[PDB]
Structure 1
Amino acid sequence: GCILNGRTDLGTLLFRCRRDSDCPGACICRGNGYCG
């Protein structure tokens, strides 16, 4: 889905996005509880 130096949909980042930092590409840590 995304890709630009980061943890695009990973194990821990799988949810509760610890921070938008885990979302390099379009993906981003939103209230949804993940780098959506």
Structure 2
Amino acid sequence: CPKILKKCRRDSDCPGACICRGNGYCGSGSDGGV
């Protein structure tokens, strides 16, 4: 489960360290595990 997350309305809203999910928050690439 991702520890760092913030409001986002697109990809640009978050650095390439993660990706903006559908819930409007940053989601870590390895979310499907932690």
Shared fold, TM over 0.5: no
Greater C-alpha radius of gyration? 2
Higher strand share: 2
